[PDB]
Symmetry: D2
Subunit: 247 residues, 4 copies
């Protein structure tokens, strides 16, 4: 029961910044060969430069396009022989009050945040089942469990991701594959930075620890779940929120 | 503190059979003017015949079509003056293991089971907010909370529905509108009633009460939530499962 | 229906607030209601309040041994087997864990948790005889989310939920359901006193933007006690205005 | 964000066998000075023998007696300077149908499984607050969350432990102390049981120990008031 990921191959979607970036760095530093994705060639290049010291690399992935995720995964499998760890972190927000919410704001969220996970998870499955080993780790927000005004779309997608994960866990468990979610609370990121103070102050006041978390806190939890230390943990949602929600 | 729905107007989607039919009958018997929907003209006619004794009616609704949900709700508002209660029960299944699930099986579930609720809930909102009164009640399987092999799609949609509901509850609560889910467990429906007896016993064994529930049990819970007896209940998931899951 | 005609109900802690509303509501629905208080004076007041519905007040100090058991035996002999038990009796003894007295821990566990063990056990034999048993435990939102200064109260209320789930699994084959109702911010005398500016901090946590009423809890209990909830067991029904959405 | 516990002092109650034993071994191997407890002298001796290679030791702790928990913790604090990690694992079962359950079966469970945690957690608190650092980790069974026939007493105690932990987490969090629970499912100590899991097998005591090490470490500094389920998918909250 070590966290040595030497010889493992990991795919981290949405690895250009914040939580995704920390996850990729952490798995790479633990010994995994890491492929991190971004939606742009500049994002991918940055990931490649950042992961270079650990032999990791950046790749372009537009989750909306058909057959792109599938090709990427096939390429990884062919080049490296297997995919051991999939971290689904790619996601966007399109916040609006339901009263004002556009159809496209709903649809884009469901496609980018939820369908993307269906596609990636399905694609890695054949290989993982054949090897009788795997980790799928989905990054889902606290908002998925408690709901949030202005985020009926984002919350629905993140909650759906949890329902998806539990169902997948039941399908693939007999082959030793675990499927879990990590639920960040208020983590210091671009999204939390753009917040006004009463909102920020209101958020920190809800936490037991009295502070925002760090992207590294999420990465730490992902490493734990990706490792042999979590081989009997599946279908779970691990909340990393400083005590803002205690289910 | 009564369950007298005299003077209330209710829309129940998917009211042709089973749970939806029982819900419509129950709200109607409690005094509500009930509009129940089906996907076909024959379904709608059958609903009309069934609800005739209570002054209810059947209408055609194909949730996949744009502007149909919206037009129906507008028509109800104009004909009957307001919409007090929305029960989102329309849903389908397209079961498969993730490893062979077709893209269309994913997409159709998300459209029919989840996007339909976005559309209907958005559409009734203007009227409910003006009235400073309302009930939205979403029927969400237990599978949404615990997951189910073969149903990554259905589970994702039903779990998403819960996240949606919690978020909506937070948006509309200041206007006195409540938004809740009812989560059926193993209920006797077309899809279960005709299962082999040995297989039925495997479901009933999981319950504390030792039996499949009845569609009427779900209807009873919906009536409670729709009434003045539940005016301080919002953002909740009421599990009606005979003890097969105790969250 | 929610017609409880012919049913016998015991409601512990029925003098005031939530418990009083529960007793009145079950009684008005047709049940023969026995409501409890810790003193004969309390019991007399309950008797006066329930008189028009044929209800009565009785004394129950949970701290005393054999009192719960004797009361239930007396009810069984005098009126008949119990159909409905509502465990509402409870106290608070708030303190920071750092300075919490042993007695503050022990008294909470005795009054709020062991009382439920004792009452639930005592009604069980008779209720198994009946067609449609109901045990309904009043827990607090604090049992599910925790609360600073209430490690004791929270532990007892959370324990009550674990107890209920386990009991539900034992007694279901006899048609008995066991459920909890979890009040959030319900207006009491002590919250009613708070400054208006202070009331706002509580209401801001709710989706509905207001405190609830004791009657809201009573309404939920009536639902669960009735034939309308025959397939609901081992559940915690949160009546909190959206302050917590599990 | 390492799992190096060098320089840390840990108290693990109920460390004689199974889960408790694995926890103590694991924290010790990670570098902590570990004190493990048992209710009997034979249990304490066995712990001492097992932890000897890591400089750990066994101590007798009868949670039912007053002032014993408190004295033990004070002794540890005086000898080692601080207590960094408390793992509350001590517990018993007294299973019976509620119909048959004796008052003593209820009372014993509440005393040994729940009050013991109140006492231990209270006792370590002053020191942890002074250090502005700590970990309290409570071992609570899946039965606390889902309930179990024959175990109204055990389930009530284990569920109560979770409520306690959440409340404590809210009180002590401003000082950087985290309070969490680990909920084991079916851990080895058959097909009808394994069929209830997604993984199709019983777990190992080491799986629980692995989760406790994670929570005890710097890798879990932003995790508090949580219940981490290690059940192979038997329950997915």
């Amino acid at each position: 029961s070590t966290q040595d990921l030497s010889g493992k191959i990991a795919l981290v979607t949405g690895a250009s910044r914040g939580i995704g970036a920390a996850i990729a760095d952490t798995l790479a530093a633990a010994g995994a060969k890491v492929i991190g994705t971004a939606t742009s060639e500049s994002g991918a290049a940055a990931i490649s430069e950042r992961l270079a010291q650990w032999g990791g690399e950046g790749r372009v992935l537009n989750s909306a396009e058909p057959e792109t995720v599938e090709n990427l995964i096939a390429d990884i499998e062919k080049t490296f022989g297997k995919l051991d760890i999939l971290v689904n972190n790619a996601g966007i927000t399109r916040d609006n009050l339901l009263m004002r919410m556009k159809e496209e704001e709903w649809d884009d969220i469901m496609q980018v945040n939820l369908k993307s996970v269906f596609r990636a998870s399905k694609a890695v499955l054949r290989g993982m089942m054949k090897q009788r080993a795997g980790r799928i780790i989905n990054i889902t927000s606290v908002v998925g469990v408690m709901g949030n005004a202005g985020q009926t779309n984002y919350a629905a997608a993140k909650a759906g991701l949890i329902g998806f994960s539990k169902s997948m866990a039941r399908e693939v468990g007999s082959r030793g594959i675990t499927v879990n979610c990590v639920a960040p609370g208020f983590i210091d990121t671009d999204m939390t930075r753009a917040l006004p103070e009463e909102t920020r102050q209101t958020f920190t006041a809800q936490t037991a620890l009295g502070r925002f978390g760090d992207a590294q806190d999420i990465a730490d939890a992902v490493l734990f779940l990706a490792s042999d230390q979590a081989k009997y943990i599946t279908g779970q949602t691990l909340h990393v929120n400083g005590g803002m929600l205690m289910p």
